Every structure is written in C-alpha cells, then in structure tokens.
Design an enzyme around this catalytic site. Structure first.
Site, PDB file in Angstrom:
ATOM      1  N   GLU A   1      -5.307   3.770 -10.373  1.00 46.92           N
ATOM      2  CA  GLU A   1      -6.229   2.645 -10.106  1.00 46.92           C
ATOM      3  C   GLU A   1      -7.570   2.626 -11.200  1.00 46.92           C
ATOM      4  OE1 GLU A   1      -6.630   1.509  -5.861  1.00 46.92           O
ATOM      5  OE2 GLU A   1      -6.170   3.306  -5.847  1.00 46.92           O
TER       6      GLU A   1
ATOM      7  N   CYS B   1       0.775  -1.305   0.075  1.00 48.99           N
ATOM      8  CA  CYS B   1       0.027   0.020   0.069  1.00 48.99           C
ATOM      9  C   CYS B   1       0.750   1.543   0.086  1.00 48.99           C
ATOM     10  CB  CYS B   1      -1.029   0.091   1.133  1.00 48.99           C
ATOM     11  SG  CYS B   1      -1.891   1.551   1.441  1.00 48.99           S
TER      12      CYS B   1
HETATM   13  C1  HEM Z   1      -6.058   6.364   2.160  1.00 52.06           C
HETATM   14  C2  HEM Z   1      -6.471   6.355   1.093  1.00 52.06           C
HETATM   15  C3  HEM Z   1      -5.371   5.002   0.075  1.00 52.06           C
HETATM   16  C4  HEM Z   1      -4.828   5.295  -1.090  1.00 52.06           C
HETATM   17  C5  HEM Z   1      -4.545   6.271  -2.121  1.00 52.06           C
HETATM   18  C6  HEM Z   1      -4.312   3.963  -0.901  1.00 52.06           C
HETATM   19  C7  HEM Z   1      -3.491   3.262  -2.343  1.00 52.06           C
HETATM   20  C8  HEM Z   1      -3.521   1.982  -2.845  1.00 52.06           C
HETATM   21  C9  HEM Z   1      -3.033   1.453  -4.025  1.00 52.06           C
HETATM   22  C10 HEM Z   1      -2.638   2.193  -5.009  1.00 52.06           C
HETATM   23  C11 HEM Z   1      -2.788  -0.010  -3.604  1.00 52.06           C
HETATM   24  C12 HEM Z   1      -2.667  -1.094  -4.891  1.00 52.06           C
HETATM   25  C13 HEM Z   1      -3.932  -1.189  -5.622  1.00 52.06           C
HETATM   26  C14 HEM Z   1      -3.382  -1.208  -7.072  1.00 52.06           C
HETATM   27  O1  HEM Z   1      -3.131  -0.230  -7.696  1.00 52.06           O
HETATM   28  O2  HEM Z   1      -3.828  -2.520  -7.486  1.00 52.06           O
HETATM   29  C15 HEM Z   1      -3.316  -0.255  -2.510  1.00 52.06           C
HETATM   30  C16 HEM Z   1      -3.288  -1.559  -1.888  1.00 52.06           C
HETATM   31  C17 HEM Z   1      -3.484  -1.854  -0.481  1.00 52.06           C
HETATM   32  N1  HEM Z   1      -4.135  -0.895   0.358  1.00 52.06           N
HETATM   33 FE1  HEM Z   1      -4.059   0.927   0.361  1.00 52.06          FE
HETATM   34  N2  HEM Z   1      -4.544   2.999   0.271  1.00 52.06           N
HETATM   35  C18 HEM Z   1      -5.163   3.784   0.538  1.00 52.06           C
HETATM   36  C19 HEM Z   1      -5.963   3.133   1.960  1.00 52.06           C
HETATM   37  C20 HEM Z   1      -5.999   1.998   2.585  1.00 52.06           C
HETATM   38  C21 HEM Z   1      -6.628   1.667   3.981  1.00 52.06           C
HETATM   39  C22 HEM Z   1      -7.661   2.577   4.805  1.00 52.06           C
HETATM   40  C23 HEM Z   1      -6.000   0.346   4.020  1.00 52.06           C
HETATM   41  C24 HEM Z   1      -6.600  -0.701   5.220  1.00 52.06           C
HETATM   42  C25 HEM Z   1      -6.905  -0.272   6.326  1.00 52.06           C
HETATM   43  C26 HEM Z   1      -5.384  -0.187   2.941  1.00 52.06           C
HETATM   44  C27 HEM Z   1      -4.738  -1.246   2.632  1.00 52.06           C
HETATM   45  C28 HEM Z   1      -4.226  -2.028   1.447  1.00 52.06           C
HETATM   46  C29 HEM Z   1      -3.962  -3.297   1.230  1.00 52.06           C
HETATM   47  C30 HEM Z   1      -4.112  -4.362   2.402  1.00 52.06           C
HETATM   48  C31 HEM Z   1      -3.537  -3.410  -0.018  1.00 52.06           C
HETATM   49  C32 HEM Z   1      -3.162  -4.674  -0.916  1.00 52.06           C
HETATM   50  C33 HEM Z   1      -4.421  -5.218  -1.629  1.00 52.06           C
HETATM   51  C34 HEM Z   1      -4.190  -6.395  -2.017  1.00 52.06           C
HETATM   52  O3  HEM Z   1      -3.050  -7.092  -1.970  1.00 52.06           O
HETATM   53  O4  HEM Z   1      -5.158  -6.897  -3.128  1.00 52.06           O
HETATM   54  N3  HEM Z   1      -5.101   0.991   1.840  1.00 52.06           N
HETATM   55  N4  HEM Z   1      -3.758   0.895  -1.602  1.00 52.06           N
HETATM   56  C1  LIG Z   2      -8.302   0.760   0.737  1.00 53.55           C
HETATM   57  C2  LIG Z   2      -7.869   1.051  -0.635  1.00 53.55           C
HETATM   58  C3  LIG Z   2      -7.896   2.159  -1.308  1.00 53.55           C
HETATM   59  C4  LIG Z   2      -7.284   2.408  -2.574  1.00 53.55           C
HETATM   60  N1  LIG Z   2      -7.218   3.839  -3.168  1.00 53.55           N
HETATM   61  N2  LIG Z   2      -6.920   1.363  -3.429  1.00 53.55           N
HETATM   62  C5  LIG Z   2      -6.929   0.105  -2.673  1.00 53.55           C
HETATM   63  C6  LIG Z   2      -6.627  -1.141  -3.863  1.00 53.55           C
HETATM   64  C7  LIG Z   2      -7.853  -1.604  -4.614  1.00 53.55           C
HETATM   65  C8  LIG Z   2      -7.825  -3.001  -5.467  1.00 53.55           C
HETATM   66  C9  LIG Z   2      -8.646  -3.075  -6.476  1.00 53.55           C
HETATM   67  C10 LIG Z   2      -8.530  -3.994  -7.414  1.00 53.55           C
HETATM   68  C11 LIG Z   2      -9.499  -4.198  -8.512  1.00 53.55           C
HETATM   69  N3  LIG Z   2      -9.449  -2.944  -9.481  1.00 53.55           N
HETATM   70  C12 LIG Z   2      -7.655  -5.076  -6.978  1.00 53.55           C
HETATM   71  C13 LIG Z   2      -6.982  -5.226  -5.976  1.00 53.55           C
HETATM   72  C14 LIG Z   2      -5.883  -6.141  -5.556  1.00 53.55           C
HETATM   73  C15 LIG Z   2      -6.847  -7.391  -4.989  1.00 53.55           C
HETATM   74  C16 LIG Z   2      -6.324  -8.655  -6.118  1.00 53.55           C
HETATM   75  C17 LIG Z   2      -6.688  -8.562  -7.407  1.00 53.55           C
HETATM   76  C18 LIG Z   2      -6.404  -9.444  -8.073  1.00 53.55           C
HETATM   77  C19 LIG Z   2      -6.899  -9.593  -9.656  1.00 53.55           C
HETATM   78  C20 LIG Z   2      -5.571 -10.421  -7.780  1.00 53.55           C
HETATM   79  C21 LIG Z   2      -5.191 -10.540  -6.389  1.00 53.55           C
HETATM   80  N4  LIG Z   2      -4.489 -11.431  -6.139  1.00 53.55           N
HETATM   81  N5  LIG Z   2      -5.357  -9.356  -5.648  1.00 53.55           N
HETATM   82  C22 LIG Z   2      -6.899  -3.929  -5.056  1.00 53.55           C
HETATM   83  C23 LIG Z   2      -7.478  -0.267  -1.669  1.00 53.55           C
HETATM   84 CL   LIG Z   3     -10.627  -0.321  -8.531  1.00 51.50          CL
END
Ligand code: HEM
Ligand SMILES: Cc1cc(N)nc(CCc2cc(CN)cc(CCc3cc(C)cc(N)n3)c2)c1
Ligand SMILES: [Cl-]
Ligand code: HEM
Ligand SMILES: Cc1cc(N)nc(CCc2cc(CN)cc(CCc3cc(C)cc(N)n3)c2)c1
Ligand SMILES: C[C@H](O)[C@H](O)[C@H]1CNc2nc(N)[nH]c(=O)c2N1
Ligand SMILES: C[C@H](O)[C@H](O)[C@H]1CNc2nc(N)[nH]c(=O)c2N1
Ligand SMILES: [Cl-]
Ligand SMILES: [Cl-]
Ligand SMILES: [Cl-]
Ligand SMILES: [Zn+2]
Ligand SMILES: [Zn+2]
Ligand SMILES: [Zn+2]
Lengths: 407, 411
Positions: free
Chosen positions: B285, B108
């Site tokens: 995103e 993240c």
């Molecule tokens: C505050 C605004 C936030 C922004 C701009 C932000 C941005 C991001 C972005 C760009 C990603 C990767 C998603 C992608 O591009 O595929 C991400 C992943 C993640 N974020 Fe953050 N995030 C934010 C808040 C949070 C919050 C509040 C949590 C949990 C309390 C969090 C936990 C995670 C986790 C667990 C992943 C990995 C998701 C996965 O592996 O599938 N995010 N976030």
């Molecule tokens: C809390 C939060 C804020 C933010 N700006 N962005 C995110 C990540 C959102 C997100 C969205 C998608 C689909 N568009 C997918 C993911 C990753 C979950 C995932 C997706 C896939 C395809 C495979 C895999 N192993 N895991 C995160 C979370």
């Molecule tokens: Cl999305």
C-alpha cells in the site's frame, strides 16, 4: 447501455457504446460477479450468418447494397439446401482478424489487423494438417522476426467429423511423473504426454522435450507427427549480469501458438484454428518458470543469488522474480527473437484501447488477464477501468478432445 | 444452488452456498462484467425487513434463533420503527454488525482478523468537538505505540439525511497536497482538493512534503470544523533501506496507521455515515501505490537513478527493480521501528487460509480478485490462482459521495 470507463491515473473518461452489440453471456449476474473464473440447426444458423454478414458489408461500406442483399440471399439459400454455408475468402479473413480484435483477454490486440490468415479448408487428412502446421510454424517464426498468423482447418459439419489439434499449443514441452514423485519437464503437460506415449510416441524423457503433434482430421482417430526440429526455434536463457544463470540449463521456445480453441465466425465453428503471435516476457519468466505447478524455479534462483530466504518480508521471491524476467528478455533480444516486455505491451494496449473507443465505440477487456502477472500497478492498464463483454467472431474454449473422442 | 471455485495452482475446489444470502447488486449483468469498475432517506416500509433479517442473523449467530429474546427484540424493534421511523441497535448488535461488515468486505485481504476488532460506540456524540475527542482516542488506542490494534469508532446513524455525522477526510491520517503555479505538486497529489478545502476553512498550511492534514468534522448536519490531531499521537516511520545508505536521504516517511474515514456502515438497514476504521498496513500500500503511482509521490525514477539502473529501455525492467527495493525499504523500516506491518506474501497466504476456513464454516467468502491480488508480484502470491466469487452481504461498508458535493452550507 451507455457506459463510462475511467482511468484513475489520468482521469480520462471514455464512453462505451459497443457493448450493446454484445451477444454471448458473461457468467455474471446482478447478484454475483464471476470475473475471476477461468471458464465461467438451420433455425439457429441463419440469424448468426446474417449478423456476421451485416457487420462484414458494413465494414466494407456497402451495407444495404445489392451485393449485400445478394450474399444474404445466397447464404440463406445455401443454408436451406445444405444446412451450412461456406465463407468467402474475404469473409474468412475478416472473421479471423475480428475474432482476435474481440479477444477480451488479449493485451496484444494493437496488432489485430496485421494477421496472416492461412486458409486450410481444403485439408482432408492428418498428414495434410501436419504440412499446413509446419508451414505456419516456419512462416510465423521467420528466423526470429515473428509474424502473427492463423491456419484455419475445415469447419464443423455434423459434429462427428471435427478437425482438432489435440495439443494445447503447437510447441510445448513434455512432462513426466517420476518414481521419485517429482515431475520432470513441464508439469502442465503430464496428461497429454501420456496420451502421446499411449499413442506410440517414443519419449526422450528429458526436461525440455518438444511434444509431437496429435492431429485429428474429419473426426478420425488422431495421428502423431514430430515437427521438424530445425523449425522449432528455441532460446537458451542467460542473465546479463549473473554468469551462473546459464547453468540452470533453462531454455524456452520462441513461438507461442494456441491450438486448442474454437473460432466461431457467422455461426460456423472452426474447431482447429491454431494461431500465433509472439511472447510478452512475463508469460515465460513469471508464469512458465515461477508458477508452483509449472517449472517452479524461484527457490533455486534465489539460492544462487544468496538472498535471505528465512523470512518472506526480505522480498527474496520478488527479487528473484525480477531477475528471471530480466534474463528472459535479454536472452530473446540477444538472439534477435521477437519479445515484448510488459511495460511496452500494456502501453501499446492503452493506445489501442483509445483508438477502439474513438473509432469503434469500445474495446472489451478482461482486466484480470490484461494486467500483467507481476508489477501490476506500475503498468498503465492497472488504473484502467475495463468493460468485459463477448462479441462475435470469437475464440472460445472447447473441451479437450480425449474426453469427447470415440475411438 | 452450489457454485464451485477452483484454485489453479493446487486444483483444490470449494463450494459456495453463501452467495444465496446476497441481496444487493454487483454492477454486472449476463451481458457485461463490471468487475474492474471502481464505483459500480429510508422508509418504514423498507426498514423492517432489513431489520428483521439482520436480527435473525444476529440471533442465529448467538444460537438463540426463535427464542423468546429473539421474538421480543423483533417485536420491540418493529414498534420502534412504526412509532419513530427508525430504531436503536443494542451494543451487542452494533459490535456484531461492525465485525460482519468487515467480514463481508470483499475487497479486504486482511479479513482473517475480522473477529478481533475493537468497537468504540460514539453514538452519544453530539458535536464536532465531541467527534475530535473520540477520533484522538481511537488513534491513540489503535496506534498503541507501534503495536497496532484494529478499531472502529461509530458515530450516530442517519436520521432524515439532513443531520448526518461525516468525517470529511478520506483517511484520519493523510498528507496535504499543494498544487503549484508551475503545475507541479508538493506533497501528496491525491489530497490536493481536500487540502484546498482545509485552507479555505482556515487551516494554516506548513506547505511541506509530509504535512499531516487537519481533521474536518461535521456533526448533526452542521458545517464542518477543523481540528489538528496532536502531533504526539501521529506515529510516523522514516523510510530507509537495509543496504542502500542513500535511501534515507530521499527524505521519505509514512504514517503507521491506515484509517479509512469516508465510508458508510450499513447494519440492519441503519446508516452510519461516520464510522472511521483502522488496522495496519500491508507493505505494498505504501511502497507500490503511495510511493510509486504516477499520480502519487511517483518516486520510481529518482530511486532507479540512484541505483544507476539502465533507464534508456523499459526492457531492462528498471522500474520493476526499483519497485522491489522501495518495498523492501518500507518493510525494513516498519520492522526496525517495531510498527506493525505485513508483507504481501504473508498477508495473501493468511487470506487463503481464512477463505478456506470461511467456506467450511460459513459456506463462502465473497472476494474481489481485482483488489485482493497485490499490486506487485501478483502471480507468485497464492491469491492470483484462486478463483473468487464477488457478491454483496450486509452488514457492509459502502461508498458515499464526498460531503463537499452534497453538504448544504449553513454559513
Ligand atoms: C488488520 C489489518 C488490515 C490489513 C493489512 C488490511 C488490508 C487491506 C488492503 C491491502 C486493502 C485494499 C487497499 C488497497 O491496496 O488499495 C483493504 C481494503 C478494505 N479494507 Fe482492509 N485491512 C485491514 C483491516 C481492515 C479493518 C479493521 C476494516 C474494517 C473494519 C477493513 C475494511 C476494508 C474495506 C471496507 C476496504 C475497501 C476500501 C475501499 O473500497 O475503498 N480493513 N484492506
Ligand atoms: C483499514 C485499512 C487497513 C489497510 N491496511 N488498508 C486499507 C485501505 C486503505 C485505502 C487507501 C487509499 C489511498 N491510498 C485508497 C483506498 C480505496 C479508497 C478509494 C480510492 C480511490 C482513488 C477510489 C475509490 N473508489 N476508492 C483504500 C484500510
Ligand atoms: Cl495509504
Ligand atoms: C502479437 C503478439 C501477441 C502478444 C504479445 C499477445 C499477448 C497475449 C497475452 C499476454 C495473453 C494472456 C496470456 C497470459 O498472460 O497468461 C493473451 C491471450 C490471448 N490472446 Fe494474444 N497476443 C498476441 C497475439 C495473438 C494473436 C495473433 C491472437 C489470435 C489470432 C491472440 C488471441 C488471444 C486469445 C484468444 C487469448 C486468451 C487465451 C485464453 O483465453 O486461453 N493473441 N495474448
Ligand atoms: C497467440 C498468443 C500469444 C501470446 N503471447 N500469448 C498467448 C497466450 C498463451 C497461453 C498459454 C497458456 C499456458 N502457458 C495457457 C493459455 C490459456 C489456455 C487455458 C488452459 C487452461 C487449463 C485453462 C484456461 N482457462 N486457459 C494461453 C497467445
Ligand atoms: C480500474 C481498476 O479497478 C482500479 O485501477 C483498481 C484496481 N485494483 C485496485 N486494488 C486496490 N487494492 N486498490 C485500488 O485502488 C485498485 N484500483
Ligand atoms: C483465478 C484467476 O482467474 C486465474 O488465476 C487467472 C488470473 N489471471 C490470469 N491472467 C492471464 N493472463 N493468464 C492466466 O492464466 C490467468 N489466470
Ligand atoms: Cl506459454
Ligand atoms: Cl497462470
Ligand atoms: Cl491505486
Ligand atoms: Zn500462473
Ligand atoms: Zn462480473
Ligand atoms: Zn494505484
């Protein structure tokens, strides 16, 4: 042990078995991934030689043959007597091609078997090195129609007689620190340039000065040579739409040629093994031109475009970046100098990787390097899971010689 | 042991000691790096050390380590595990745990915000209807009419693994995908399978390009139930471009609230299988992934057509040009509608500052470069040249299998 890689765009799953032949270490552990770190005796030698020869004879489909056994015998006797051994021409060529084949950070490996290998093991002096290098430069450049090549100088012996090219690439531009405090030319080459000035190079003190070669033979103190200017093909950079672009005075050289790495084949170490292909456009337009610590021209380009540079969210940086990269490719194409854009290069790598999986059982790949430095997710490699492991023959990093060299 | 990381643009070198605290595994070995692999019922026995270590960290952070309150809490939790096989977290621990799972989330980029997280304790929830209400309240709170606020809602923890609370949606708000008989897809191809499930469970599908999906909610290991989020609670932004007037006529919109709802929250050995969390979007995103992936809305060709770029050769970089325009449009639309959004330049710059801060005060900041580096313009962002170390700290967010693969249907 038996690994699957998934492509997340296409759902294609591929099975890797090649990694079990993996030899060297990654820097990673079960506790910590280091995937983003740029740099993570007779007894020893015969196993390495046997490993290489076994794979060589297997590739020419005579594994276990008398000629296989005989060569193993011969090399073993040679190592006992002389504590080293000499590769056959056929083995040298195979090894060099496979070092490229195994280069996990190289996107251009679809080409790996078409490598021209120049055996410079008979070279004895820095002057010899210079002649070999000019010929490589001219051959590879081939008037703009570039051909992959490597030139291999004598192997390490006792470690006190290394051949080395002191330059990091055969062709690069000088960098000079100013009284100003700004840098003129390429900031990446400031230190090397000083070693050249220190060694007696007459520096022109311009923005795009081709550096001299600093060549070391037989562990001797390195000497300075200037590549004939008519052999260094360069490309002035212009834009197909922006007529002002030419006025930035930008140019780059056509031949990318890494000269500071070490080729290991069958336990033998070739410390001077300059190799070259051709550029992927982003290497110049993204890295060389836009890195803050390189020519750093984003701001100037943006201004001439009259973009709103007040806030990052206008994406003015991204706009200027695309334009610089369009101009790079267009200028190489107009001058008929081989270049590959990042779409077509990564698409080729995906085909290569599938062949390697099918015919070899895998393809070691370092995602951090394989994904281009711009527009990552619109190229097919972004969604491609990759396994990174180290196979031999290999190109390895080695310490800059001015830290090692006793004068 | 000290591990050093270098930034290749600035030459700044940081020293990591925090990695010493890492217990969980990476996928990697000495022989293979799995850094680009997407995906690489507890006993009393395992539970107490996991609890003890969490509680030690909690009490250190409040400067009460070794206090009577600390020793009493350990003793209390111990007796509770021996006697009931599990334990209940205090509200203060829960909040602390949830903040840290985010702080520890190595993929993240948004973690500068970790300490500002509104935690909604839904541990008293008992039915799918209860869940629906909690989730609506989260959405309204987090949305805050455009001025987005980070939040997480935490439903009861796993007990025997036969009574799990699960949100079946992968995100609270997502658009349906419909696979047509001619092999084309209407709406979001990423959500075809889930959409088919919703339909099978009885959802009446509008069958348009941007249909907000129903919630499918499972409480206490029971069969899940369908609920429609009130449309007035789902904030959406129509996408237009600041100079190209034809852009609005592509018919694009997106929702303002990104809210991950399929992950598992582990705190002190306890497992929270339903723990939806939301922040705000980084522009890429939507504009790079959601719109431009070939397996998603895939709008690159149509946009480039409309810009009349030269599409005969990839070397004109027509794809790159359309990509920038689409992303300009996403940021412009969110800003014009006063819905919180961050661009990738600003977001990555904030993360580097956050990361340096974490190294100073915490001794490290685990980070996954593959995910942290944005999916366009990677090397003109300050994270590209930043060496990172990826390792697993708890509390954490973990992946879990999609519930339709494991759920035992009651009928
Ligand atoms: C505050 C605004 C936030 C922004 C701009 C932000 C941005 C991001 C972005 C760009 C990603 C990767 C998603 C992608 O591009 O595929 C991400 C992943 C993640 N974020 Fe953050 N995030 C934010 C808040 C949070 C919050 C509040 C949590 C949990 C309390 C969090 C936990 C995670 C986790 C667990 C992943 C990995 C998701 C996965 O592996 O599938 N995010 N976030
Ligand atoms: C809390 C939060 C804020 C933010 N700006 N962005 C995110 C990540 C959102 C997100 C969205 C998608 C689909 N568009 C997918 C993911 C990753 C979950 C995932 C997706 C896939 C395809 C495979 C895999 N192993 N895991 C995160 C979370
Ligand atoms: Cl999305
Ligand atoms: C045919 C044209 C070629 C293309 C388009 C190509 C492409 C690339 C690119 C894009 C990189 C990463 C550099 C960057 O983006 O920063 C790379 C790295 C590498 N390439 Fe290739 N390459 C080609 C030929 C070769 C040849 C002929 C060899 C060896 C014989 C080779 C061996 C390597 C090695 C060892 C690296 C890693 C460099 C390092 O770790 O410092 N390349 N190449
Ligand atoms: C044969 C070849 C063809 C091609 N198209 N591209 C390449 C990569 C060239 C290259 C260029 C630079 C600098 N612009 C740097 C490298 C890597 C050398 C290096 C240098 C440093 C300081 C650290 C580190 N990890 N690696 C390779 C090689
Ligand atoms: C194979 C590779 O790990 C995969 O395509 C990853 C790469 N980086 C990513 N980065 C983000 N932020 N989100 C993703 O889904 C992915 N996908
Ligand atoms: C820290 C990180 O490993 C470093 O910035 C890398 C990222 N990816 C790269 N990829 C390529 N092809 N070349 C590079 O020099 C780098 N630099
Ligand atoms: Cl270069
Ligand atoms: Cl770089
Ligand atoms: Cl993706
Ligand atoms: Zn760079
Ligand atoms: Zn790793
Ligand atoms: Zn994607």
């Amino acid at each position: 042990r038996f690994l699957k890689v998934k492509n997340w765009e296409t759902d294609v799953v591929l099975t890797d078995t090649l990694h079990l032949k993996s030899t060297l270490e990654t820097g990673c552990t079960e506790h910590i991934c280091m995937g983003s770190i740029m740099l993570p005796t007779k007894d020893q030698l015969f196993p390495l030689a046997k490993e290489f020869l076994d794979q060589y004879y297997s590739s020419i489909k005579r594994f276990g043959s008398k000629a296989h056994m005989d060569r193993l015998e011969e090399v073993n006797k040679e190592i006992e007597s002389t504590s080293t051994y000499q590769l056959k021409d056929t083995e040298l060529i195979y090894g060099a091609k496979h070092a490229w084949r195994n280069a996990s950070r190289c996107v251009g490996r679809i080409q790996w078997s078409k490598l021209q290998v120049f055996d410079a093991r008979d070279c004895t002096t820095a002057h010899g090195m210079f002649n070999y290098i000019c010929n490589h430069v001219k051959y590879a450049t081939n008037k703009g129609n570039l051909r992959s090549a490597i030139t291999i100088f004598p192997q390490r012996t006792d470690g006190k007689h290394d051949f080395r090219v002191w330059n990091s690439q055969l062709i690069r531009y000088a960098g000079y620190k100013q009284p100003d405090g700004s840098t003129l030319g390429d900031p990446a080459n400031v230190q090397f340039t000083e070693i050249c000035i220190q060694q007696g190079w007459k520096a022109p003190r311009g923005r795009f000065d081709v550096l001299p070669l600093l060549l070391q033979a037989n562990g001797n103190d390195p000497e300075l040579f200037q590549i004939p200017p008519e052999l260094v093909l360069e490309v002035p950079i212009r834009h197909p739409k922006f007529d002002w672009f030419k006025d930035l005075g930008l140019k780059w050289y056509g031949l990318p040629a890494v000269s500071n790495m070490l080729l290991e084949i069958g336990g033998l170490e070739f410390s001077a093994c300059p190799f070259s292909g051709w550029y992927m456009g982003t290497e110049i337009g993204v890295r060389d031109y836009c890195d803050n610590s390189r020519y750093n021209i984003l701001e100037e380009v943006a201004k001439k475009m009259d973009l709103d540079m007040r806030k990052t969210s206008s994406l003015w940086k991204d706009q200027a970046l695309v334009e610089i990269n369009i101009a790079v490719l267009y200028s190489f194409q107009s001058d008929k100098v081989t270049i590959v854009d990042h779409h077509s290069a990564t698409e080729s790598f995906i085909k290569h990787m599938e062949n390697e999986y099918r015919c070899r059982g895998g393809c070691p790949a370092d995602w951090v390097w394989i994904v281009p430095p711009m527009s990552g997710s619109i190229t097919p490699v972004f969604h491609q899971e990759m396994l990174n492991y180290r196979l031999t023959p290999s190109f390895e990093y080695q310490p800059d010689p001015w830290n090692t060299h006793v004068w």
